[PDB]
């Protein structure tokens, strides 16, 4: 509306924007084994698929990308792009060489031969699936029979299960085979999240420490805003974290030194504007709730009800016109004036 | 020779590593159940094994864990010795009834053989108890210890006790059986075995972050009521 | 969540609406009247104790015995959740309370429809057992024995609040029923709703943009269904203790700016005065 | 005022599109085919069929008092037109005549 | 009268289908895959609550 009467009205909000940005990737760097993975020339037939884990390394996929023009790249519960900036607990590499027209049967919920006699892919899973074409090197002219897969199986496979117990089939790859049948060199990576603390993260580098100041903080993949403060907390020399009632993040361990650090959310609250009709003045008065004066008419007053800005503290007293807080009124007198209210007259 | 006791409220241990203080909270995962049979020796690893002992003498060094215990198989074989720990899971051909010579390793094992894991550290041991918590889950393998003194008692001593944890081995591999270790002449030896089984327990913190106290929620009604009321 | 729609200014209004009407249900029930009247310096009043409810100047906060066993008795920044402080603050009711103690001492019931008249106390008293069927010598001939009773009478009563522990659960309620509502509503942020995790921050900082917002989506409808249970709730509450609030007021009109007839209304007997 | 407030909310509610590629139904109709009709058509039923709920609950919550507000007044005009009352300050302030 | 019928629309409410193949669990889970088992379930969870 154009037309504004007197009366006090809550309008938006505020909060305290951030400064800089810090960052605590600790020192450590590494090589993963990712060229041994790759480029092996061994490649294990997909009943007795290979099984290696990673771990306390630098993970670098750009490798990934040079190695060669994927047929698939396919990531299920991470966008492939943005694979450079995770940090895992783990990652789990399943190596071996499937036929061609298989390669869409290794999905989670779905079924075929592979998927319920030889390798069973639970429907939670969080990894990414690649493969890529083989004929040039695992195709024999005469056939390569070195690859079997499990045809019969009375009962199907459970998740991550191998076994090793005619139902055995011998693959045959030869040149002349057309698309669909050439073999394909298949890898799949498992991740897993929220355990002890990641390891294979080294893409980015470090900052300093900065304290009493809403700044941004990044503690090992911990992202967040806040301020960052000295700490009283005797922690055990095995907890990195922190709770509270509220189940949210209070205090941090930094990983260079053993100090603990505590964590508070920079400063808001709500706004409120005071004012008299438009038909009498155009003048306003603001109140920050529950804040207090310095975090913040060239007048400022400080109330239980937080902070007032643009009125000017009579010690008289009359009744109440604007109520504000805590038996504090405002009222226009020219100019606005806060006072506290009167009971009555005395007798 | 077998025998049978009481467990009481022994057996608890920090489920995670996250700090907390003055709070309740409740917690789900495999615990000794309060008040159960723990067998007394003079052996299934099941879904967890919790081991206590108070001998002085430190014949007791070292357990063997395996599914088939032969050299087919990895096998775990934790050496406990005066100055370091040797944690292996090499495929070793498991002797019929191991132990120290005292320090030739023959007699527990023939040879050595492929494998991949190794670990050397400070060993594991230090009126004395000693309680020590066994699971194996998701690829891992963890150990809990914790040493409190005890009064002469023939059975377990009566109070509260936490267990911090102590290694965390990514070792992830099919064990089903255990034995124990043990360095010798003739003796005796003396210790306890009990068996965790999935529970939902209310774990009590301290304005110093250790736990105090805790209720499990399927021994009794009263006890159901407390969790409900949290 | 700009997609959804005004939900957001309907939960504003309904709060902003209950604010004041709790301000109001204060305002209507303890501002009876308009003079603030004192007692005289001398406390005789014919045998009469008053100074178990009359305030003590002695302690900063001039509240009476009854008032400070009361008040230590009861006993008790979030997400976007805020807590306002009341319009008059505990200082002012006490006046009201003692303003309307000394009215009805120095004067019955006459301040209450009009002008402030003087009158002995035990002349008020005669007139209060003439209102319910007792002569005026009735009293007149057993004064003192009256006011002892009456004075056993106020003494016993911070005994018996004090030895029974449940004597004011209609006042924790309020205080319970609003603790819980409140860390229920906190404690609904850390539910997934079928979704990958419960922080925005970790999903879009793991995803790419087009995929995010099937996640988002329901987490949003999840809080926005929270915020809607609570606003519900509170309103459904706040009309309860509006009745409450009438209900007290008419009590206060009634029982002590006048002598009631009505059974059972001002305790059980023969009302003289509260 | 209330009454208009809650009419008006109402009725504009019905242009949100609620995660929808169009608020019209005859648009999605006459562009989409029908097995690709029923998933945008879902998100507008459950919005619309959330906002009269909404509405319908206030209006239970308002009646309520307008129910109150009704009884003390009858209440009000039995006792103090049909008769003279001796209740304080309920048929106004000073010593009640007559209503 | 009042708590018979709601009690009554309450009891009748559980044969809705809430835009899924079925109302009962059993067939759902029985003749479709869990990927499609986990979605279909969620409009009669949500309707039900
Ligand atoms: C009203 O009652 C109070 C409480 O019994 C009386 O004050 C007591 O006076 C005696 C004698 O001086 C003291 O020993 C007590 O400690 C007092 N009580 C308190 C709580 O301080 C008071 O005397 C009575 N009123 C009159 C007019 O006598
Ligand atoms: C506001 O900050 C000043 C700075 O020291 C402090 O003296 C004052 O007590 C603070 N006010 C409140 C209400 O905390
Ligand atoms: C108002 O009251 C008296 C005036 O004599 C003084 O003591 C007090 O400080 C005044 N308050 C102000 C000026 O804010
Ligand atoms: C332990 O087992 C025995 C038999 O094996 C049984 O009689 C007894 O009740 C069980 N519990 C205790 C506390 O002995
Ligand atoms: C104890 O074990 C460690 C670890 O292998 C070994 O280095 C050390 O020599 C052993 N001590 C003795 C006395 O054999
Ligand atoms: C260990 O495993 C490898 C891998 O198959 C095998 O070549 C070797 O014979 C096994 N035994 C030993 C003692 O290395
Ligand atoms: C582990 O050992 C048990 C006991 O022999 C056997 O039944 C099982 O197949 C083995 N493997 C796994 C993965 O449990
Ligand atoms: C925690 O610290 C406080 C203060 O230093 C101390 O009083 C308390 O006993 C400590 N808790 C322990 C040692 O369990």
Redesign the interface.
């Known amino acids: 509306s154009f037309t504004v009467e007197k009366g006090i009205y809550q309008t938006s909000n505020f909060r305290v924007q951030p400064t800089e940005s810090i960052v605590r990737f600790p020192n450590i760097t590494n090589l993963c084994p990712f060229h041994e993975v790759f480029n092996a020339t061994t490649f294990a037939s997909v009943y007795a698929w290979n099984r290696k884990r990673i771990s306390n390394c630098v993970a670098d996929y750009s490798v990934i990308y040079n190695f060669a023009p994927f047929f698939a790249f396919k990531c299920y519960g991470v966008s492939p792009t943005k694979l450079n900036d995770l940090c895992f607990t783990n990652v789990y590499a399943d190596s071996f060489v499937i036929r061609g027209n298989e390669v869409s049967q290794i999905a989670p919920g779905q079924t075929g031969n592979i998927a319920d006699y030889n390798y069973k892919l639970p429907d939670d899973f969080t990894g990414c699936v690649i493969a890529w074409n083989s004929n040039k090197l695992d195709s024999k002219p005469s056939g390569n029979y070195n690859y079997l897969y499990r045809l019969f199986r009375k009962s199907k496979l459970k998740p991550f299960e191998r076994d090793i117990s005619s139902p055995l089939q011998s693959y045959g790859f030869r040149p002349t085979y057309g698309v669909g049948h050439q073999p394909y060199r298949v890898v799949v990576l498992s991740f897993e999240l929220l355990h002890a603390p990641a390891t294979v993260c080294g893409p980015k580098k470090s900052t300093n420490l900065v304290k009493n100041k809403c700044v941004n903080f990044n503690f090992n993949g911990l992202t967040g805003t806040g301020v960052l403060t000295e700490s009283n907390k005797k922690f055990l020399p095995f907890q990195q974290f922190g709770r509270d009632i509220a189940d949210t993040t209070d205090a941090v361990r930094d990983p260079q030194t053993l100090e603990i650090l505590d964590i508070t959310p920079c400063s808001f609250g709500g706004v409120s504007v005071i004012t008299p009709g438009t038909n009498t003045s155009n003048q306003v008065a603001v109140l920050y709730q529950g804040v207090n004066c310095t975090e913040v008419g060239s007048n400022v007053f400080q109330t239980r009800a937080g902070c007032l800005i643009g009125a000017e503290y009579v010690n008289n007293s009359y009744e109440c016109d604007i109520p504000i807080g805590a038996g504090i009124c405002a009222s226009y007198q020219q100019s606005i004036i806060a006072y506290t209210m009167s009971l009555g007259a005395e007798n | 020779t077998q025998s049978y006791t009481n467990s009481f409220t022994r057996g608890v241990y920090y489920p995670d ?5 003055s ?1 309740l909270h409740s917690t789900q995962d495999l615990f000794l159940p309060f008040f159960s049979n723990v067998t007394w020796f003079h052996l299934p690893f099941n879904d967890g094994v919790y081991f206590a002992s108070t001998e002085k003498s430190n014949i007791i060094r070292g357990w063997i864990f395996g599914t088939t215990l032969d050299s087919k198989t990895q096998s775990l074989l934790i050496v406990n010795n005066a100055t370091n720990v040797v944690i292996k899971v090499c495929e070793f051909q498991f002797c019929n009834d191991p132990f120290l010579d005292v320090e030739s390793e023959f007699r527990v094992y023939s040879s050595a053989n492929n494998c991949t894991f190794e670990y050397v550290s400070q060993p594991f041991l230090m009126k004395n108890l000693r309680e020590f918590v066994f699971k194996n889950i998701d690829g891992y393998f963890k150990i809990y210890s914790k040493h409190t003194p005890i009064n002469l008692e023939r059975d377990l001593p009566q109070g509260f006790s936490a267990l ?2 102590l290694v ?1 081995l ?1 070792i ?1 591999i099919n064990i089903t059986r255990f034995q124990t270790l043990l360095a010798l002449t003739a003796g005796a030896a003396a210790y306890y075995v009990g068996y965790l089984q999935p529970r939902t327990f209310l774990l009590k913190y301290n304005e ?3 736990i105090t106290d805790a209720v499990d929620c399927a021994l009794d009604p009263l006890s159901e009521t407390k969790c409900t009321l949290k | 969540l700009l997609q959804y729609g005004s939900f957001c200014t309907q939960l504003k209004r309904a709060l902003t609406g209950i604010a004041v009407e709790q301000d109001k249900n204060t305002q209507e029930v303890f501002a009876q009247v308009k003079q603030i009247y004192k007692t005289p310096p001398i406390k005789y009043f014919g045998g009469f104790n008053f100074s178990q409810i009359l305030p003590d100047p002695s302690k900063p906060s001039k509240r009476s015995p009854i008032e400070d066993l009361l008040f230590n008795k009861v006993t008790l920044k979030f997400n976007g959740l805020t807590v306002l402080p009341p319009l008059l603050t505990d200082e002012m009711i006490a006046q009201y309370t003692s303003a309307l103690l000394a009215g009805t001492i120095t004067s019955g019931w006459t301040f209450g429809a009009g002008p402030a008249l003087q009158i002995p106390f035990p002349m008020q008293m005669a007139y209060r057992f003439n209102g319910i069927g007792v002569t005026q010598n009735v009293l007149y001939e057993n004064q003192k024995l009256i006011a002892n009773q009456f004075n056993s009478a106020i003494g016993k009563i911070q005994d018996s609040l004090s030895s029974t522990p449940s004597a004011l659960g209609k006042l924790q309620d309020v205080v319970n029923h609003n603790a819980q509502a409140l860390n229920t509503l906190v404690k609904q942020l850390s539910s997934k709703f079928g979704a990958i995790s419960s922080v925005l921050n970790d999903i879009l900082s793991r995803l790419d943009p087009p995929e995010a917002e099937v996640q988002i989506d329901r987490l949003i409808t999840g809080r926005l269904q929270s915020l809607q249970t609570y606003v519900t709730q509170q309103l459904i509450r706040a009309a309860e203790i509006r009745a409450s609030a009438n209900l007290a007021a008419t009590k206060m009109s009634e029982c002590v700016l006048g002598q009631s007839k009505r059974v059972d209304f001002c305790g059980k007997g023969y009302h003289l005065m509260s």
């Not at chain 2, 590593?17 to 203080?21: E, G, I, N, Q, T």
């Open positions: 590593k996250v700090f907390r203080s709070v911090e944890p965390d990514p992830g110093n972050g250790t």
